[PDB]
Paper text:
Centriole biogenesis begins with self-assembly of SAS-6 proteins into 9-fold symmetrical ring polymers, which then stack into a cartwheel that scaffolds organelle formation. SAS-6 proteins contain an N-terminal globular head domain followed by a long coiled-coil, and a C-terminal region predicted to be unstructured. Moreover, SAS-6 homodimers can form higher order oligomers through a weaker interaction between two head domains from neighboring homodimers, with a ~40° angle between the two coiled-coil pairs. Here, we developed monobodies against Chlamydomonas reinhardtii SAS-6, characterizing three in detail with X-ray crystallography, atomic force microscopy and cryo-electron microscopy.
The binding mode was identical to that in the co-crystal with CrSAS-6_N, with an overall RMSD of 0.855 Å.
Residue numbers in the entry:
A (entry chain A): 15 to 159
B (entry chain K): 0 to 92
Write the structure that this text describes.
């Protein structure tokens, strides 16, 4: 449970995302990202990060991520992150900005991908070079609010 | 560098109760805009809403007619915090 009353919005704008689903065609579509930091109603001491992916065109397209300070430690180790939970939102925003600022003839090229396969969808921002898609951030999103 | 503040802020269209404000966006990729409106020299606390960074216009509703209002647009970017870089105008509805 997130306290939307005590929540602060850091980022609210569309971001270009490559959306892959199992039975549908790949689509390059601009999805609205809203990033919120705040505390839970159950405990002002628990700090939480909220990211909401939505489409202005589709009312059924909703994907949500909530990360707690405890959850961040697992994310920090598994992904080699070197910043604290306080700096974590700003780094995500800068990565989202690089996807927005990406140009067609970019090498390496920054690209954002939302992969929807059943009950979960995995969001990733990658830098595509000659060798590999190197991962900058990978986040697990659940359908709904 | 280039300025992170919105450039030209004006009331484009108006109703006795509502205003539509337009601004020219800063060259920086804007994360969000925060708009504060209140009555010029009034006793009432200032009202604030947020609009997406892609938007260059906003609508303020519920206003009282013939009253002078002070409207401020705050633009957040890489180098601008929430309430840094403000542009304000005064309008009589």
């Amino acid at each position: 449970g997130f306290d939307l009353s005590t929540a602060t919005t850091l980022f609210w704008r569309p971001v270009p995302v490559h959306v892959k689903q199992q039975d549908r065609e790949d689509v390059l579509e601009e999805l609205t990202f809203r990033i919120l930091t705040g505390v839970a109603k159950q405990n002002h001491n628990l700090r939480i990060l909220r990211i909401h992916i939505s489409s202005d065109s589709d009312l059924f397209f909703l994907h949500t991520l909530e990360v707690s300070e405890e959850d961040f430690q697992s994310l920090k180790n598994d992904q080699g992150i070197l910043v604290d939970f306080a700096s974590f939102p700003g780094k995500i925003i800068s990565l989202l900005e690089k996807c927005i600022l990406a140009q067609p003839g970019d090498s390496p090229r920054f690209q954002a991908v939302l992969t929807i396969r059943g009950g979960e969808s995995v969001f990733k921002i990658v830098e595509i070079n000659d060798f590999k898609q190197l991962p900058h951030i990978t986040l697990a999103f659940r359908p709904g609010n | 560098s280039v300025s992170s503040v919105p450039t030209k802020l004006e009331v484009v269209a108006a109703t006795p109760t509502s205003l539509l404000i337009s601004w020219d966006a800063p060259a920086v990729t804007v994360y969000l805009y925060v708009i504060t409106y209140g009555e010029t020299g009034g006793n009432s606390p200032v009202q604030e809403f947020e609009v997406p960074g892609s938007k260059s216009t906003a609508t303020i509703s519920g206003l009282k007619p013939g009253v002078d209002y002070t409207i401020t647009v705050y633009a957040s970017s890489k180098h601008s915090s929430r309430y840094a870089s403000p542009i304000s105008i005064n309008y009589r509805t």
